Amino acid sequence: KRYVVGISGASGIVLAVTLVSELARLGHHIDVIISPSAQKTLYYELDTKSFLSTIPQNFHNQIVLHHISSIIDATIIVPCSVATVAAISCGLADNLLRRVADVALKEKRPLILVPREAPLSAIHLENLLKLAQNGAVILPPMPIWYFKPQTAEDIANDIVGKILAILQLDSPLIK
Amino acid sequence: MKRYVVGISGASGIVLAVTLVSELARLGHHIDVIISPSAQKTLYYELDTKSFLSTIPQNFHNQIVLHHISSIESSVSSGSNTIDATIIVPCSVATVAAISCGLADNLLRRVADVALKEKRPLILVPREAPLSAIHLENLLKLAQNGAVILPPMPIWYFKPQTAEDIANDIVGKILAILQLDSPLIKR
Amino acid sequence: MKRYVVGISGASGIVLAVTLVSELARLGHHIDVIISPSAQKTLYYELDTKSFLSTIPQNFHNQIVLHHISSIESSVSSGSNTIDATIIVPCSVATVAAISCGLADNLLRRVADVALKEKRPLILVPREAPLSAIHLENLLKLAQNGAVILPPMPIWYFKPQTAEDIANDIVGKILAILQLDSPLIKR
Amino acid sequence: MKRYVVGISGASGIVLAVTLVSELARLGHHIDVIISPSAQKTLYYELDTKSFLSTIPQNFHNQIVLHHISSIESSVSSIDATIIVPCSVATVAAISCGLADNLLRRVADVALKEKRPLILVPREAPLSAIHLENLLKLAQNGAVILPPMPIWYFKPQTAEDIANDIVGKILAILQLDSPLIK
Amino acid sequence: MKRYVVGISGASGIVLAVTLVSELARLGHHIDVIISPSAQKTLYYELDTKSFLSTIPQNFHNQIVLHHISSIESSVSSTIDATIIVPCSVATVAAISCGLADNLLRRVADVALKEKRPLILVPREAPLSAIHLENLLKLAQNGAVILPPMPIWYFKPQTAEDIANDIVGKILAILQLDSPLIK
Amino acid sequence: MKRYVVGISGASGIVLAVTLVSELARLGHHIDVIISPSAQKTLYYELDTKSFLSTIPQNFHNQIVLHHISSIESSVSSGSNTIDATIIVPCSVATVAAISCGLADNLLRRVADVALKEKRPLILVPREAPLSAIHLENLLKLAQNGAVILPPMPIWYFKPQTAEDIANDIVGKILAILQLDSPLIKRWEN
Amino acid sequence: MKRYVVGISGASGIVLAVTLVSELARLGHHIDVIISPSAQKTLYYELDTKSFLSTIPQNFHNQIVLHHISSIESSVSIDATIIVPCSVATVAAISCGLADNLLRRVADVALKEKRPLILVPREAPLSAIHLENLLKLAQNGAVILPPMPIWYFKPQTAEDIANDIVGKILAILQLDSPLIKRW
Amino acid sequence: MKRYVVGISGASGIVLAVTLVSELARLGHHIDVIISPSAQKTLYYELDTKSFLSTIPQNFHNQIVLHHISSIESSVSTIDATIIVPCSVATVAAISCGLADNLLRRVADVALKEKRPLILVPREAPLSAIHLENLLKLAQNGAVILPPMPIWYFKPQTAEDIANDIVGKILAILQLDSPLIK
Amino acid sequence: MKRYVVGISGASGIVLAVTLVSELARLGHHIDVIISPSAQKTLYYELDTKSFLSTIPQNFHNQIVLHHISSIESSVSSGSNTIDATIIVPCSVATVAAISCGLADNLLRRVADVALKEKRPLILVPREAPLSAIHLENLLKLAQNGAVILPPMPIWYFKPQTAEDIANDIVGKILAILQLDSPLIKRW
C-alpha cells in the first residue's frame, strides 16, 4: 500500500519515526515530507540530523524523502503543528505538505492529523473542528494508560498503535 | 494556603490526578476532591486501588476533603466560597459535554460551572482520541467561555525515559498554568 | 378548575414554589408537583422540613399529586394529557441547561419538554447569580422556543417590608402571567 | 457472522427492536443489546413482559448479549453497525451533545467518533425546534436519521405488517438481504 | 363550525388525509382540499381510486370544496382556523420553508405562517437527510407544527387502520378538537 | 483607596445602589456616581426623596462625586483615568440594550463602554421580569464581552427576614465580586 | 370596550394613525396615544395641523389619552399595541430593546408580555440594516405590516388606499369594521 | 461644484473636520455641516473656540450650511458623499443599528440606503469587540471605514503635518485632487 | 524587571516601536525584539538607518535581545517563559491575518500565538486605512480571543505640537495598557 507521512514542526518526531519504521516493516511504501521546522525538532529530540538514520537500513528502498518546496491509501501528518493545522483548514495549499493534505480532503481520501499543542486555544480548536467536519481524522497523541505503560517508549508505541488501527492495518503495536 | 478543587472524571490517566493532588498538598494548599463513579472504576483498573487517598501520603490527608459526586450542597458547590483554581483531570468527553451545556447536575459538573460563572480559573484535561466534530465543538465553546483546554500531550522535548516522566511533565504544565513553582515544572 | 404542573428544581427560593402551589389550590385548581432530589435538600435547608406537603395547608392536599422524579411513565409525561400551564420554580441552571438541550430524561425535564413540543405555557423561574454566557445562551434558546423566562426579581416599587412580601409579590407575577386574579397580584 | 449493537431506548415501538434483534439473530449474526430502564418500562407497557429475552426464540439466545446500561467499562465501549431503536428524543439530545455518560449513549458516541454506521430510529410527535436541531446536528455528523414511518405503498394490513416493513428498511440500510425487505 | 384547509401532497400515506377530512366533516366543519398531481398518483397506487371524494361518504361532500393546485387566485389564497398538509413530501417541505408560494398548496401554507394561524405539516420521508432536517427546523422555528406520522404502539394497535386512526387522532388533538380518534 | 464608578439607571431597586455606595465609602474608597433622569424619578417613588445624597451619611460625602448624565467630557468618561470597577445598579434593560450595542451617548452608557474597552471590571445588575429573547440576547452579548451579569437575585439560603436583609445580601454578592472584605458578605456552610 | 396603545412615530403616513384611532374609538374602545416629536412635525407637514386631536371628531376625545414621549413612568409602562407609522429609527430601537422613551417602552412591554405588537414601518428602499431589524422583530412575535396599497380593491382616491390599509390593521386586531374588505 | 455632507461627531480630532471642510470649500464645493452637542464640547477643548465657523477662513462661509442636530426634517435628510469625521464609537453604534434618530445619524443612514458614499473616520482606542463588530457590519453595508492613522512614511514634523496627510487620504477617497494628497 | 516581547511588523510607524522599546528599557525592563524583513525596510525609509539598535540609547542594549524572524526554536517561542506582555507594533494586516488564522509559522506570528494560548497580554497596533471587511473580521476575531486591538489613534485632546508629541502620547497609551507607571503617560 502507499502512505504519505508528513512531519510538521511540532514536538514528538518519535511518533513519526515509529510509524514510518512500522509501516515499512509491514511491507508498505511511504512518502515522507519533512518541514524545515521538524528537521530541527529532529535534532533537538533524537540528536541526529538525518531522518533516515532512525529507520532500519533495510527499509530505505520503501521510503522516499520529499522536499517541502517542490511544485495513495492514506495521508498522516505526524506530529502536526498548529500552524500546519491552520494552513490546511484555510485551504492554504502553498507547500507540498499542505498540498498533499488538501488533495486528500479534495478527493475524500483518509487524512489523519496528529496535533500536538497544549493548551489548545479557541483559534486552534476552531481549525481542528473545521477539519473534522471536512473529514479529517483528528487524533491527538493521548497516552492510553490502561495498558500500564512503563517506559516513555511504551507510550509512543501505543499511540502509533492507534494510528495503525485507523489505517485498517494489523500490527503487534495495536493492543 | 491556596484552595483548589480537583474533579476526577472517568477518562484514562488518573495517575495525572494523583500526582497533581500530591504536589498541591506537598506545596501546602487545600484541595477539595470529587471523584465520579466512573473515575472510581478507572482508579481500580489503572492504579489497582479503590481508595483515592491510598495513593497520596497520609501526612497530607488533613489538606484534602473528598466530596461525594451527589453532594451538590457541599461548600464547594457555592460561588460564595473562594477557590483559587478548579481542575478537571482527567476529563472525559461526557463531562466536557455536560460542562459545555451547563448541565451542572452533579457536584463535579457543578464545580466547573461555578468556576465559569465566577470567572475563576478552570483547567480541563480532556482525554479522548480521535476527537470527533461533536467533541471538538464542545471544547471550542468551553475555550471561548474561558476554560483552559489542556489535553495530556507528552512533552517530548524533555526526553522522558519512563512513563512517570511523561505524567510528571504533563502535571508540571498544569502547575505552570496555576502559576505555582514546583520541581515538576521543566523548561 | 385548571390543571397545573409545578416542577421544583434545586435552586434557592423553594418558598416561591410553596406559596404558588398554596395559592393555586386556594383558588380551586389541581397541581401536579414534581420535586427533584436537590430541591428536597433545599426544602430542608431553607424551610427546615423534609415534607413539601407539610408546608401546604392540609385541606389543600387532596388537590395536589406528588410525582416521583423518575416516573417518566406518568400521565403528565405524555403530551395527550392536557395541562393548562407548567411552572418550574425555582429552576436551577442545570435544569435550564437540560430543558434547553432536549434532555428530557427525568419527569421534571420531561414535563417542560412536553409543554414546549405541544406549545403549552412553560414558565421557568431561574435563580442563579451571576449568569454566565453559558447560562444566558440556554435561557435565550428557551425564550426563542416560547418559554417564559421569569427570574425572581424583587419588586421594590411595591415597597416590601419583609422577606415574605418580596416572595408574595414575586408569586404575584407568576399568577399574573397565568391569568388568574389573586390578592397576591399588585398593579 | 457480523456483530451489531442494538440500544433500546425508552420510546414507543419496542416491537421494532424485537423484530430487528430477532431477524439479525435468524441470519446468524451476533447482537450486543443494551436496554435502558425507561425501555424496560416500555417493554412492559407495550408487550406485557418483563423479560426482553422472552421475546426472541429461545434458540437464538446464544447469539445475544445483554449489557447493563451502567457498564461504561464494558466491551463495546472501546462493531458492524449500531442501531438505537426505538430512540427517545432525550437520548437523541444526549448523543447530539456528546453526553456519553451511560452505555447506550456511549456506544453511539463511539460509532460517531470511529465513522462506523449509526442508525437512529427517533420516535416523537410533534418534533419541536429543539428536537429538530439535535436531529440535524446528528445527520450532519453522519448518523442515519430513520424515524419509524409506515410505508403504506406496500399496502399493509396488520400492525405487524407496518412494523415489519419499517424493520425491513433498517435491514436494507445494513445491506443485508431479508424477507422483511420489499 | 370551523374552517380547515387540507393540502394533500404526494408522500405515501394518503389514507391519513382521507381519515382526517372524513372526521372533520363528521364533526361538522368545512374543509377546503387541495390535491397535488403527485398526491393524485399516490391516491391511485395506495387507495386504488382516481377520485378523492369517492373515499369520503357522500353526505359530507357539501362540506368539502376541491381547489385546483394552480388556482392561486382562490379565496383560500388570501380566516381559516387551521391548515394541514398531509401527507407532506420533503419537496413541499422545502418549498414552504423557502417561501416559494407558487402554487395553491404552497400558498395556503405561506398564508398560515404570514397570518400566524395554525399550520400542521405531516412530513413522511425516511431516512431524513441534513438538507431536509434543516428545512423542518426552519419551519418549526417559524411556528409550523411538525407532526410526522409516528405510530403509537402503546395504544397496542392490531391493524394498519388502527395505526392510521391513532396518527390522525394526534393531528386532531393538535387541532384542539374532541374526536374519538384521540386516545 | 480604590476608585469606583456607580451608574444608577432607572430600574426598580435603587436601595441596592444606596447600600452599595454607602459601603464602598465606609471601606475608605472613592465613588463617582451617575444618576439617570429615570433613576432620579425612581429614587422619589422608592425612597421618597429627590436627593440621592440624603440617603448616605454626610460623613461620606467628601468621598463621592455626582456626575450629570450628559457630562461625557467628565474625567470618568476617559480611559486614561484608571478606575478599579464600574457597577451599573440597578440596570434597566434599556441601558443593557445601549451598552450591548456600544451606544455610548451619555455618561452612564459611556462609563460602561470604557470599562469594556479597557478590560476593567463591569458589574451590571439588570432588573426586569419576564426577560424576552431580545433582552436575553443583549445580556448574552455583554457576558461574552466580559461584563458580569449579576441580576438582583434573592439569596434565600441565608434565611432573610426583612426586605433590607434581601438587599444587603445582594449588595454583599456585589462586594464579593469586587473582592472587597465587608460584613455585608455572607457565605455558604453545610 | 378594549384598550389599545397607538404609538405614532415620525415616518410618512400619519393619516394612517388618524384613521385607525378614529375608528377604534368609533367602535367603543379606549386608545392611549403617544406621539413622538418627529411625528408631530410630520403631522404638520402632511395634515397641516400641530394638534392630533384636531383631526379626530370631538365626541371621541374622552376615549383618548395622550401621553408624553418621555413619560416613561406611565401606567402604560394591554390588548394590542400598534406603532403607526413606524420609522426605521423606531424599528431599530425596538429591535435592540432600546426602551428609553415611552413609545419604545410600550413596544418592549408588548413583546415581553407576549401581547400583540403591530408595526407599520414605512421606508423605501429598505437597506440590509433595516431588513435585519425587521426580521429580528418578526422572529420575536411582532406583526410586520408595511403600508402596502391593496390594489385589487380598485381604489379611486388616496383616502381609499389609506382606509384599506387601516382595514388590514383592523383585520389583524380581529375587530369587525366597515373599513375591512375581503376578497 | 460637488455637494458633500460632513457630520461632526464627538470623538477626538475635530481638527480633521476643520481642515477637511475648509479644503473642500477651497476647491469650490458645497458642504452641509452637522455638529453634535458632544462635538461642540470637543471643539472647545481641542481648538479653544466655541464657534466652528471661526476655524474656517471667513471667505468660504457662503459654501457652508450648518444644520441643527435635531433638524431631521431637512433636504439633506443628491449628495456626492457623506463623511462623519471625527466619528465616535457611539455614532458608529447608532449607524450600525440603523438608529437614525438625529440628523447626523440620519444622513449616514440615507447614504447607506441610497448606496451613496459614506466615509466614517472612527476614533477610539482600544477598539473592543463590540466596536469592531459594528465597524465590520458597516463595512459589509458599503461604508468606507477610515480610522485616522498617521502616515509616517511622509516624515511628518509637526502635529499639523499628520492631520493634513490624514485629510489627504480622505480627499483621495473622495477622488479629489488636492495639495493635501501626496 | 518585567519581560516584554515586541514584534515589529512591516507597517508604517516603526517610530512607535522605537519609543516603546527604549521607554520599557529605561524603566528597567527586559525586551526581546523580533523585526520582520519588511519592518527592517520601513526602518530605513522612516528612521534613516537599518540598525534598529542605533535608535536606542546604548546604555539600554544589555536589556534588549534581537531574535531573527525565522528562529521558531527560540525561547520566546514556548509557553515556558512567563512573558509579561507581547506587543506587535506596528502590525501589518498580513500579520493580523496570520495570527487570527493561527498561522504561526515564523517567530513573530508564533510569539503572538503563544500569548493567546497562555492567556497573557497580546497588544496589537494595526495600521491600515481604510479597513476592509476582511480585515475588520480578523481584528474582531482576535479581540474575541483576548487580544487588545490598539490602533495608533492620535490623542488630540492632549493638544500635541510636534509629530513626536503624537507618537509619544500613543506610546503612552500602550504603556497605560501595560499598567506601567511612566512619565510618557498623560491622563485626561
Ligand SMILES: Cc1cc2nc3c(=O)[nH]c(=O)nc-3n(C[C@H](O)[C@H](O)[C@H](O)COP(=O)(O)O)c2cc1C
Ligand atoms: C523543539 C520544538 C518543539 C515544538 N513543538 C511544537 C508543538 O508541540 N506544537 C506546535 O504547534 N508547534 C511546535 N513547535 C513550533 C512549530 O514548529 C512552528 O509552529 C512551525 O512554524 C510549524 O511549522 P511546520 O508545521 O511547517 O513545521 C515546536 C518547535 C520546536 C523548535
Ligand SMILES: Cc1cc2nc3c(=O)[nH]c(=O)nc-3n(C[C@H](O)[C@H](O)[C@H](O)COP(=O)(O)O)c2cc1C
Ligand atoms: C441550599 C442550596 C441552594 C442552591 N441554590 C442554587 C441556585 O440558586 N442556582 C443553581 O443553579 N443551583 C443551586 N443549587 C445547586 C443545584 O441544586 C444543583 O445544581 C442541582 O444538581 C440541580 O439539580 P435539579 O435542577 O435537578 O434540582 C443549590 C443547592 C443547595 C443545596
Ligand SMILES: Cc1cc2nc3c(=O)[nH]c(=O)nc-3n(C[C@H](O)[C@H](O)[C@H](O)COP(=O)(O)O)c2cc1C
Ligand atoms: C410507555 C411509554 C412510552 C414512551 N414513548 C416515548 C416516545 O415515543 N418518545 C419519547 O421521547 N419519550 C417516550 N417516553 C419517555 C421516555 O422514555 C423518557 O423521556 C426517558 O427518560 C428516555 O430515556 P431513555 O432514552 O434512556 O430510554 C415514553 C415513556 C413510556 C413509559
Ligand SMILES: Cc1cc2nc3c(=O)[nH]c(=O)nc-3n(C[C@H](O)[C@H](O)[C@H](O)COP(=O)(O)O)c2cc1C
Ligand atoms: C478504563 C476506562 C477508561 C476510560 N477512558 C475514557 C477516556 O479516556 N475518555 C472518555 O471520554 N471516556 C473514557 N471512559 C468512559 C467514561 O468513563 C464514560 O464516558 C463515563 O460515563 C464518563 O463519566 P464521568 O466523566 O463523570 O466519569 C473510560 C472508561 C473506562 C472503564
Ligand SMILES: Cc1cc2nc3c(=O)[nH]c(=O)nc-3n(C[C@H](O)[C@H](O)[C@H](O)COP(=O)(O)O)c2cc1C
Ligand atoms: C407512490 C409514491 C409515494 C411517494 N412517497 C413519497 C414520500 O413518502 N416522501 C417523499 O418525500 N416523496 C414521496 N414521493 C415523491 C414525491 O411525489 C415527489 O417529491 C413529488 O414531486 C412531490 O410533489 P408534491 O409534494 O407537490 O405532491 C412519492 C411518490 C410516489 C409515486
Ligand SMILES: Cc1cc2nc3c(=O)[nH]c(=O)nc-3n(C[C@H](O)[C@H](O)[C@H](O)COP(=O)(O)O)c2cc1C
Ligand atoms: C418606578 C419605576 C420602576 C421601573 N422599573 C424598571 C425595571 O425594573 N426594569 C426596567 O427595565 N425598567 C424599569 N423602569 C423603566 C426604565 O427606567 C425605562 O426603561 C428608562 O427609560 C430606562 O432609562 P435609564 O436606564 O437610562 O435610567 C421603571 C420605571 C419606573 C418609573
Ligand SMILES: Cc1cc2nc3c(=O)[nH]c(=O)nc-3n(C[C@H](O)[C@H](O)[C@H](O)COP(=O)(O)O)c2cc1C
Ligand atoms: C474632549 C473629548 C474627547 C472625546 N474623544 C472621544 C473619542 O476619541 N472616541 C469616542 O468614542 N468618544 C470620545 N468622546 C466622548 C463622546 O463624545 C461621547 O461618547 C458622545 O456621547 C458621543 O456623541 P456623538 O458621537 O453623537 O457626538 C470624547 C469626549 C470629549 C469631551
Ligand SMILES: Cc1cc2nc3c(=O)[nH]c(=O)nc-3n(C[C@H](O)[C@H](O)[C@H](O)COP(=O)(O)O)c2cc1C
Ligand atoms: C415629513 C417627514 C416625513 C418623514 N418620513 C419618514 C419615513 O417615511 N421613514 C423614515 O424612516 N423616516 C421618516 N422621517 C424622519 C424620521 O422622523 C426620523 O428618522 C426621526 O429621527 C425618527 O423619529 P421617531 O421615529 O422616534 O419619531 C420623516 C420626517 C419628516 C419631517
Ligand SMILES: Cc1cc2nc3c(=O)[nH]c(=O)nc-3n(C[C@H](O)[C@H](O)[C@H](O)COP(=O)(O)O)c2cc1C
Ligand atoms: C514602506 C512600506 C510601508 C508599508 N506600510 C504598511 C502599512 O502601513 N500597513 C500595512 O498593513 N502594510 C504595510 N506595508 C506592507 C506590509 O509590510 C506587507 O503586507 C508585509 O509583507 C507584511 O509582512 P510583515 O507585516 O510581517 O512585515 C508596507 C510596506 C512597505 C514597503
Ligand SMILES: CC(C)=CCOP(=O)(O)O
Ligand atoms: C450549595 C449552594 C448554596 C449553592 C448556591 O450558591 P450560588 O449562589 O448558586 O453560587
Ligand SMILES: CC(C)=CCOP(=O)(O)O
Ligand atoms: C409516558 C410517555 C413515554 C409518553 C409519551 O407521549 P407523547 O410522546 O407526548 O405523545
Ligand SMILES: CC(C)=CCOP(=O)(O)O
Ligand atoms: C471502556 C473504555 C476502555 C473506554 C475507553 O475507550 P476510548 O479510547 O474512549 O475509545
Ligand SMILES: CC(C)=CCOP(=O)(O)O
Ligand atoms: C389571492 C390574493 C388576493 C392574495 C392576496 O392576499 P394578501 O393581502 O396577500 O393576504
Ligand SMILES: CC(C)=CCOP(=O)(O)O
Ligand atoms: C472624555 C474623553 C477624553 C474620552 C476619551 O478618552 P479615551 O479614548 O477613552 O481614552
Ligand SMILES: CC(C)=CCOP(=O)(O)O
Ligand atoms: C414603570 C414600571 C412599573 C415598569 C415595570 O417593569 P416590570 O414589568 O415590572 O419589570
Ligand SMILES: CC(C)=CCOP(=O)(O)O
Ligand atoms: C424629511 C423627509 C422627506 C424624510 C423622508 O425621506 P425618505 O423617503 O425616507 O428618503
